[PDB]
Structure 1
Amino acid sequence: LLQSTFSVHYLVLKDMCSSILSLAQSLLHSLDQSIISFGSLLYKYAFKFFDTYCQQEVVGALVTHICSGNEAEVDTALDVLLELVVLNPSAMMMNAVFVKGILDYLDNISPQQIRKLFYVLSTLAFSKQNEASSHIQDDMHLVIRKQLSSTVFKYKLIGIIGAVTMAGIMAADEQCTQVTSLLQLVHSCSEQSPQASALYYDEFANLIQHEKLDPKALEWVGHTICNDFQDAFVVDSCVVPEGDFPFPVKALYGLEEYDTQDGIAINLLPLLFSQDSPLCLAPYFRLLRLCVERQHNGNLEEIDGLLDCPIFLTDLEPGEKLESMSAKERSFMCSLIFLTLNWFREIVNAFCQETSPEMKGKVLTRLKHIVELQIILEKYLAVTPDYVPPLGNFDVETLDITLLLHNSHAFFRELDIEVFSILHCGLVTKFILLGPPELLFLLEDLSQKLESMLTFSHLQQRSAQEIVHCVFQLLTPMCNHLENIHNYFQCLAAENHKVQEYHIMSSCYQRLLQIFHGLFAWSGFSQPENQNLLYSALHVLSSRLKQGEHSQPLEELLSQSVHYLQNFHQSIPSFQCALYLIRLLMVILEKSQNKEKIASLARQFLCRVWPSGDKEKSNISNDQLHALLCIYLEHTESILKAIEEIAGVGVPELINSPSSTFPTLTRHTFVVFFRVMMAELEK
C-alpha cells in the first residue's frame, strides 16, 4: 500500500513532508515491530522521493532517534541509516555532518549497535571525492584513540571493534600505513587483557573472512601471525613440562601417526596454571588458518603437523578417584577440558574443507577424541554444578555479561556447516557387523544449530534461507544412509528383544528425527519462493522407496514421503523419537484425508510396549504424553468418539493391574490423560 502510495502520488505528497515526519517520530516510540517497520518505510521513501530539505530533516530525525533512543528504536534506526547510505550515499554525504555529531554521545549505545554505527560512518567517510572532508576520518581516529586508551574493558572493546571495523572498510598504500598502525596499536593495547585479546583475534578473524579485501595488508600481517603463533605456544615435545602440578602432565590425546619424539607440541596446562594467552589459542589459530587460506589458497602444508599434534595435558580422566576435593583445581580441570574441546573444534573447523583422505581420517580421530572429552566434561560438570568457566562468545554474549547445555552451544567454539560433510563416511556398527559417537556428536550439534538459528556469531551473519539451503544438501541425501543403517540396527534390536550401544543409537535416531522436524518446520516455507527447495527435499525422500517419479505432483510427493516415513514407528525404541516422528509427519502433511495417518500412528505408539526401563519410562514423562495425546485427540476424525474410546479403556486400570490392556496407561500417567481428555472435551 505505502509502496504504491509513494510511487504514484509523490507529486501530491511532496508538499506535505512536515506532517509525515511528525507522524514517523510518533510511530517509532511505541512497540510492536510491525509499527516500527512501517515508520522505517516512511523515513526511507521520505528520503528517497522528496527534496533536499526533507532529506535533511530525515537524517536529523534519525540522529535524534538513535541518540535519545531506546534499544528497539535505536536498532531500527540504525538499520534505516544503513538503508539510507546504501540507497543514496551521494545525497547522504552532504548531511554526513549531523551524522558525525552522534559520536559525542556513545554512553547509551551497545557494542553491536556500535559496530553498525562505525560501519555507516566509515562507509560514508571513504567515498573517494570527499577526502576534502577527511575531517570525520580524523575525529573517528581520535575517538578510537581515546577508547582504546582505557583500563575499562567496556571501553576497550568499543575501541577495538571500531578500529578493526574501520580498517576493514578502508581496504576496498597510505591506506596500508593507516591499517598497519591502527592494528599494531590495537594489538599492543589488547596484549594486556585475555578477554580483550580473544575479542581482537575472534572479531578480527570473522571480520577478515567477511570483508575478503585488502589482501596486501593481510600478506603483511600473516608473516607476523604465523611467527607469533609458532613462538607463543609451540614448544619442543617434552612429555614432562616445567611446573609443580598435582597432576601427571603428559602429551595426551595425540593421534600417534606423527612421530612421538617430535618438536611441535602445544603447552597448555603450564600456561593456564601460570596464568592462575591460552584463552586466545583457539581464536588465534582460527585467525592463522584464515590468513594462510587467503594467502596460500587453502594450502595447509605448513600446519597439518597441528592436526596430528599431541596436547600437553594432565590426565583429564574420569576422576571418580578424585571425588570430594572441590577447589581451584576442579575449575582447572573443567576449564582445561573446555579449552582442549575448543581447540579440537577449531581444528575440525580448519581441516574439514581439505579433501586429502589421511586428513579426513585425522579429523575423524579428533571427532572421537572430542566426543570422549565431551562425555568426560559433562560428567565433571555433573560432579559440581556450580564450577562454570565464564568464557562466552563475543558478538553478543561478552558485552552482555561485561551447565553442560550452556557450554555445548555458547561457550565452546562454534563449528562450521561444512563440518557435516564428515557424516558422509559410512556407519560401522560395532554390535552387529565414522562410528556411532562421532555421528552422535555432529547430529547433537546440528540440532542445537538449526533450533538456535531458524526458530552464535559465525552462523548468525548468514541468512536463514542459505543455511537451510546448505543443510538440505548436507543432511538429507547423506543422512538417509545413516538412517537406513540405523533402521537395520534397530530391526535386529527389536528382533532379539549391550545397553550403551542401543542407548546411543536410540539417541542418534531421536536426534535425527528432531533434525528432520526442525528442517521441515522452518517457517520460511510459508513464503512461495522457498517451496522448490522443499520440492527437491521431498523428491529425495520419495526417491528412497522407488525412483523414476520426477517432477511429481505435490500431493503425490507427500503421499510417497509419508509412506516411506511412517514405517519407522516399529523401529523406534523410546518415546521422544516417536513424538518427533509424528510431529514431523504432521508438518510435512500440513501441506495437503491426512488426519487418519497421524491418528493411526499415534495409536500405534500408545499401543506399543515401550520397555519399562526406569530411564526409558522417564522419557515417557508427563508433558510429552500430554502433547502426543492432544495431537491424537485433536487430529482424530471425531473427538467425542475418541474420548469414549479412552473412557472405555481408562476404567480397567483399577481392576487388573495393581500396565493395562492399552499400555503407557498407569495411575501416574492417568492424571495427564484425564486432564488432556477434559481439555479436548471443552475444545
Structure 2
Amino acid sequence: QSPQASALYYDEFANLIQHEKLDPKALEWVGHTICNDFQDAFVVDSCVVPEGDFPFPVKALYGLEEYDTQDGIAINLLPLLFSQDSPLCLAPYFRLLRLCVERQHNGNLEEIDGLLDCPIFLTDLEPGEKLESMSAKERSFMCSLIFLTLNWFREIVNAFCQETSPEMKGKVLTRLKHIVELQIILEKYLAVTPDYVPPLGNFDVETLDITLLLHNSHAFFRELDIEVFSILHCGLVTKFILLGPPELLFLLEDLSQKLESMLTFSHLQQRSAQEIVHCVFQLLTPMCNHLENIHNYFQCLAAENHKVQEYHIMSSCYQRLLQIFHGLFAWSGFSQPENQNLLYSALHVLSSRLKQGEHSQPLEELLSQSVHYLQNFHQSIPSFQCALYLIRLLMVILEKSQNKEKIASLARQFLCRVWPSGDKEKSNISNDQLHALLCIYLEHTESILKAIEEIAGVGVPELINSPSSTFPTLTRHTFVVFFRVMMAELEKTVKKIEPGTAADSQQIHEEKLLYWNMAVRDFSILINLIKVFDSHPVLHVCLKYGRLFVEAFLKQCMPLLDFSFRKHREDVLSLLETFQLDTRLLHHLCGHSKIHQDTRLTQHVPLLKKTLELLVCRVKAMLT
C-alpha cells in the first residue's frame, strides 16, 4: 500500500540476500514470483507513445540502439509518476530481482541482458532553456524523473559490472556516459529551480531520521558497489590529443567520495575499512598506474604542442588519481602492525614502476625508489590543486622515515612553475590551497629565516615590474596569503628558541644571540614592506602577528640579554639598536591604525602599545 514501505521491504529483503547465502528453497520460491511481478508491473511493449495526456513528448529514450528498436521489453516511468499525481521502488525492486537471479542461476543474466539494451519510456529531458520560468509541478516531475532514471542506471551498473563479456562492458560504458550527461542535466534543472528537491533517500538510517549536488551524490542516490570500479581496468583513450575520460571521471569521483566518507552510505558501511582499502589495493594500483602514465604522456604532448573541455576533464582525472593515492596511503590503519606487509606490497608496486627484481627490500629503500618514480610527475600537472595533492602525498609517504630536502625542492618547483592563466585556471590557485603549500614549503625547508629572506627578496619586485613576478603565484592579490604564511612560520620558528643560562658555553650563546639578530632583522624587513601596500586585511594580519612576535622577543630573548651582558656587550647593544628601529616602526603602525580609525585594527592597539612600553622599560632595566 505505502510506496516507502514497499521500498523498505525491497531494500531490507535485498540486504538479507546480499549479506546471507541461506539455503535457497525460499529464494527459488520467491524469485519465480518477483521476476513475473516485475515483468508485469513495469515492463510494457516498446511503443514510443504510452497512454496518458502528457504536456511532454514521451518516447523510448536512452536505448543502446545496437538492439532492434521495434522490441518488447521497455520500462514505463513517466506514465507511472503522472498516475501517482511503483516507480519509487524501481531501483530497490530491480536490486532484489538482480540478487535473487544471481543466487538462483549463479550469476547467469541470459534472461535479462536485454534490459541493459532496453530503451526507457521517458519524456525528452532536454536542456529546456525554452521551457524557463514555468517552475510549476512539471519541473518537480522532470527533476524527480532524471533522479530516478540516474538511480535506475546506477543499479544497472551495480548489476552488470561483475559480468566479463566485452559487449556487456561496452554497454555498461555507454550507460556510464549516459549517467554523467543526465547528472549534468539534473544539476542544471536544480540550477534552473533550486527549492525543487525530489525527496528519495535510502531507508536504514535516513528515512527514520526525517520520519544541493553533494547531498544527492552520496545520500539521496542509490549507493554503488566496489566491484563497479572493475570498469576502471579499461585503458584511457584521450579525446583531445590522439573507456574515455568522462566515463573514468565518474568512477574515480565515486571511489573518492566512497573512501573519504568511509575511512576519515548503506552498501559500503556494511564492509570494514580494512577490507575496503584491501580490495582498492588490487582494483586501483596495478591498473591505475597505466592510466597515470598514459595521463603523463597526454600532458607531455599538451605541453609539446602548445578542445578545452576534454583537457579540463583530464586535469580533474589527474587530480582524482593523486587524491585516491593520498586518501589510500594517509589511511590511519597503517600505523597498526598487521597491514605493513600490505604497505610492503603497495610500495613494491610503486618501486616496481621503474625496475623490478629488488624483492624483500628495506622500507626506506622502497620509499626512495617509489618517491623517485612519483616526483617526476610535477611537470605533467595542469593546475595547482593536483600539485598540492602530489606534495602532500609525498609528505605523508616519506613521514615513515633528510626527507625535508625533497619536499622543499618540489614545493619550490611548484611555486616556480608557469600555471597557465586561464580565468578558471588561476581560480584553481585559490588562497587557502596556496596557504597550505607555503606552510608545507616554509616548515620543510633547511632554514625558515633564510627562506623568509628569499621570499622578502622576491616579494618586493612585485611592485616594480607587474602593475606576476620572477617567482609566480606572487601578485598584489596573493601578497596577503604569502605575507600571512610568512609571518605565521616566522612565529612558529621564533617561539621554539629556548633561553640557556650564564653557565652555558660561549659557542651556543653566540649562535642563539646571532639567531635572535637575524630573527629581529627578518622582522624589520617584514614590517618595513607594510608602508608601500594598503589593503585592510594585510595591515590586520601584520598588526596581529607583529604583537605575537614582540611577545616572543619579551619571553625568550630578554633572558639571553640578562645571561650574556657582562661578556657579549657589543652583541646585546647591536640586538637592542636593531630592536629599537622596529619598536619605532610598530609605534608608527599603531599610529596608522588610529588615524584611519579602522575597527578591525584598533581592537589590538592598546596591548601592542603597553607591550612597547614594557619592552622600553625592560631595555632601561638591562642598560642599568
TM above 0.5: yes
Pair 1:415-2:224 in alignment: yes
Please list the CA deviations of residues 193-223 of structure 1 after superposition, one character each: whole Å capped at 9, or x if unmatched. 1122111111210122212214211122112
Cα distance in 1, alignment partners of residues 55 and 294 from structure 2: 46
Q: 2:211 aligns with which of 402, 408, 419?
A: 402
Q: 1:297 aligns with which of 95, 101, 106?
A: 106
Q: Which residue of 2 aligns with 1:523?
A: 332
Aligned-partner residue type, residue 349 of structure 1: N
Pair 1:632-2:441 in alignment: yes
1:151-170 equivalences in 2 (<5 Å) = none
Cα distance in 2, alignment partners of residues 543 and 376 from structure 1: 43
Cα distance in 2, alignment partners of residues 302 and 351 from structure 1: 13
Cα distance in 2, alignment partners of residues 214 and 402 from structure 1: 35
Q: Shift of residue 651 of structure 1?
A: 1.3
Q: Which residue of 2 aligns with 1:623?
A: 432
Pair 1:604-2:413 in alignment: yes
Cα distance in 2, alignment partners of residues 220 and 440 from structure 1: 41
Please list the CA deviations of residues 489-513 of structure 1 after superposition, one character each: whole Å capped at 9, or x if unmatched. 1111111221111101001001111
Pair 1:309-2:135 in alignment: no
Two-structure CA RMSD over aligned residues (Å): 1.1
Aligned-partner residue type, residue 337 of structure 1: I
Q: Which residue of 2 aligns with 1:505?
A: 314
Aligned-partner residue type, residue 144 of structure 2: S
Q: Which residue of 1 aligns with 2:299?
A: 490
Please list the CA deviations of residues 87-123 of structure 1 after superposition, one character each: whole Å capped at 9, or x if unmatched. xxxxxxxxxxxxxxxxxxxxxxxxxxxxxxxxxxxxx
Aligned-partner residue type, residue 633 of structure 1: L
Cα distance in 2, alignment partners of residues 546 and 571 from structure 1: 21
Q: Which residue of 2 aligns with 1:200?
A: 9
Cα distance in 2, alignment partners of residues 601 and 381 from structure 1: 41
Cα distance in 2, alignment partners of residues 253 and 269 from structure 1: 14
Greater CA radius of gyration, 1 or 2?
Answer: 2
Cα distance in 1, alignment partners of residues 33 and 293 from structure 2: 50
Q: Shift of residue 637 of structure 1?
A: 1.5
Q: Shift of residue 334 of structure 1?
A: 1.3
Cα distance in 1, alignment partners of residues 413 and 475 from structure 2: 17
Q: Percent identity?
A: 100
Cα distance in 2, alignment partners of residues 546 and 320 from structure 1: 55
Q: Is the partner of 2:88 in helix, strand or coil?
A: helix
Pair 1:439-2:251 in alignment: no
Cα distance in 1, alignment partners of residues 88 and 130 from structure 2: 28
Pair 1:357-2:140 in alignment: no
Q: 2:393 aligns with which of 584, 603, 607?
A: 584
1:266-415 equivalences in 2 (<5 Å) = 266-415=75-224
Cα distance in 2, alignment partners of residues 655 and 406 from structure 1: 48
Aligned-partner residue type, residue 515 of structure 1: I
Q: Is the partner of 2:25 in helix, strand or coil?
A: helix
Aligned-partner residue type, residue 240 of structure 1: V
Please list the CA deviations of residues 325-375 of structure 1 after superposition, one character each: whole Å capped at 9, or x if unmatched. 212111111111111111111111101111122211111111111112112
Pair 1:237-2:40 in alignment: no
Contact 2:140/2:197 (8 A) holds in 1? yes
Cα distance in 2, alignment partners of residues 657 and 494 from structure 1: 25
1:61-72 equivalences in 2 (<5 Å) = none
Aligned-partner residue type, residue 323 of structure 2: Q
Aligned-partner residue type, residue 649 of structure 1: V
Q: Shift of residue 594 of structure 1?
A: 0.7
Aligned-partner residue type, residue 642 of structure 1: A
Pair 1:676-2:474 in alignment: no
Cα distance in 2, alignment partners of residues 319 and 596 from structure 1: 56
Aligned-partner residue type, residue 556 of structure 1: E
Q: 1:649 aligns with which of 433, 453, 458?
A: 458
Cα distance in 2, alignment partners of residues 653 and 400 from structure 1: 55
Cα distance in 2, alignment partners of residues 382 and 558 from structure 1: 46
Q: Is the partner of 1:215 in helix, strand or coil?
A: coil
Q: 1:215 aligns with which of 24, 31, 36?
A: 24
Contact 2:60/2:120 (8 A) holds in 1? yes
Aligned residues: 492
Q: Which residue of 1 aligns with 2:280?
A: 471
Q: Is the partner of 1:209 in helix, strand or coil?
A: helix
Q: 1:538 aligns with which of 343, 347, 365?
A: 347
Higher deviation after alignment, 439-448 or 545-554:
545-554
Contact 2:241/2:302 (8 A) holds in 1? no
Q: Shift of residue 525 of structure 1?
A: 0.4
Cα distance in 1, alignment partners of residues 54 and 28 from structure 2: 40
Bigger helix fraction: 1
Q: Runs in 1 of length 4+ with deviation above 4 angstroms? A: none
Q: Which residue of 1 aligns with 2:523?
A: none
Cα distance in 2, alignment partners of residues 584 and 542 from structure 1: 15
Please list the CA deviations of residues 609-630 of structure 1 after superposition, one character each: whole Å capped at 9, or x if unmatched. 1111111111111111111111
Q: Which residue of 1 aligns with 2:380?
A: 571
Q: Shift of residue 653 of structure 1?
A: 1.3
Cα distance in 2, alignment partners of residues 450 and 303 from structure 1: 31
Q: Shift of residue 542 of structure 1?
A: 1.1
Aligned-partner residue type, residue 383 of structure 1: V
Cα distance in 1, alignment partners of residues 137 and 194 from structure 2: 15
1:69-108 equivalences in 2 (<5 Å) = none
Cα distance in 1, alignment partners of residues 319 and 128 from structure 2: 30
Q: Shift of residue 303 of structure 1?
A: 0.9
Cα distance in 2, alignment partners of residues 424 and 316 from structure 1: 32
Q: Shift of residue 547 of structure 1?
A: 1.6
Cα distance in 2, alignment partners of residues 297 and 624 from structure 1: 50
Aligned-partner residue type, residue 323 of structure 1: E
Q: Shift of residue 555 of structure 1?
A: 0.6
Cα distance in 1, alignment partners of residues 166 and 393 from structure 2: 36
Please list the CA deviations of residues 552-607 of structure 1 after superposition, one character each: whole Å capped at 9, or x if unmatched. 11111101111111111111010110000110111111111111111111111111
Cα distance in 2, alignment partners of residues 317 and 477 from structure 1: 40
TM-score, normalised relative to structure 1? 0.71
Cα distance in 1, alignment partners of residues 365 and 252 from structure 2: 30
Q: Which residue of 2 aligns with 1:160?
A: none
Please list the CA deviations of residues 368-400 of structure 1 after superposition, one character each: whole Å capped at 9, or x if unmatched. 111121122222222222222121112221112
Cα distance in 2, alignment partners of residues 319 and 552 from structure 1: 61
Please list the CA deviations of residues 445-500 of structure 1 after superposition, one character each: whole Å capped at 9, or x if unmatched. 11001001111111100000000000010001101111111111111111122111
Q: Is the partner of 1:312 in helix, strand or coil?
A: strand
Cα distance in 2, alignment partners of residues 467 and 387 from structure 1: 35
Q: Is the partner of 1:313 in helix, strand or coil?
A: strand
Which structure is richer in relative contact order (CA contacts within 8 A, separation 6 or more)?
2
Cα distance in 2, alignment partners of residues 394 and 546 from structure 1: 50
Q: Is the partner of 2:478 in helix, strand or coil?
A: helix
Q: Shift of residue 430 of structure 1?
A: 2.0
1:19-58 equivalences in 2 (<5 Å) = none
